[PDB]
Amino acid sequence: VNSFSGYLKLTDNVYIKNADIVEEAKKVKPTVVVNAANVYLKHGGGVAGALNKATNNAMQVESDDYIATNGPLKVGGSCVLSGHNLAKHCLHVVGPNVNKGEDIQLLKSAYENFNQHEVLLAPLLSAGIFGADPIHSLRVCVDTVRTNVYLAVFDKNLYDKLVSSFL
Ligand SMILES: c1ccc(CNc2ncnc3[nH]ccc23)nc1
Predict the structure, then answer these.
(1) Position 50 in a domain
(2) In a domain, 34, yes or no
(3) Phi/psi of residue 39, each to 5°?
(4) Of residues 119, 111, 107, the one with CA closest to residue 33
(5) Atom 5 of ligand 1 has which residue's CA nearest to it?
(6) 29 is in which domain, residue-wise?
(7) CA distance 151 to 103
(8) Domain-located, residue 1
(9) Does residue 21's CB lie within 6 angstroms of at least one atom of ligand 1?
(10) In angstroms, what is the span from residue 78 Cα to ligand 1's centroid?
(11) C-alpha 153 to ligand 1 mean position (Å)
């Protein structure tokens, strides 16, 4: 039993809710919140900008030190950093950004990072400003992640479409 509430169950291991991931993170304090990161960990907008704003920019400060030491992530890759006031840990995962021309096949590699964590609160990777079709992202999630994932979808309209079209 865990503390996630109001989720619709899609499969054995995937759950989905219309929620603001920031507000859900602050209420649940999950072990892991996933950030929709870019390779530079520049948290300017979308989910990343919102999560970073909620940390009062502490996420960005920590991220800049990470990049200065380690260099950029790979598209499809991830790193574990602090969850600050939102979670124990933040798993920064880089989905392909269609608006940069990145290969959508890398979306499966991105979701594979979730399998290193038993339970996660997450957004749909490569959705929103990353330009992928969220229905495709949900399909890849279900077909790739084997650990327990709680997906927060900010937009109520998209949430209803994802549920109604789910196979
Ligand atoms: C429109 C469609 C999809 C998204 C995906 N981005 C997010 N997904 C979950 N929670 C969020 N909070 C802020 C952003 C965010 N954004 C905007």
Answers:
(1) yes
(2) yes
(3) -65, -20
(4) 119
(5) 128
(6) 8-165
(7) 23
(8) no
(9) yes
(10) 19
(11) 6
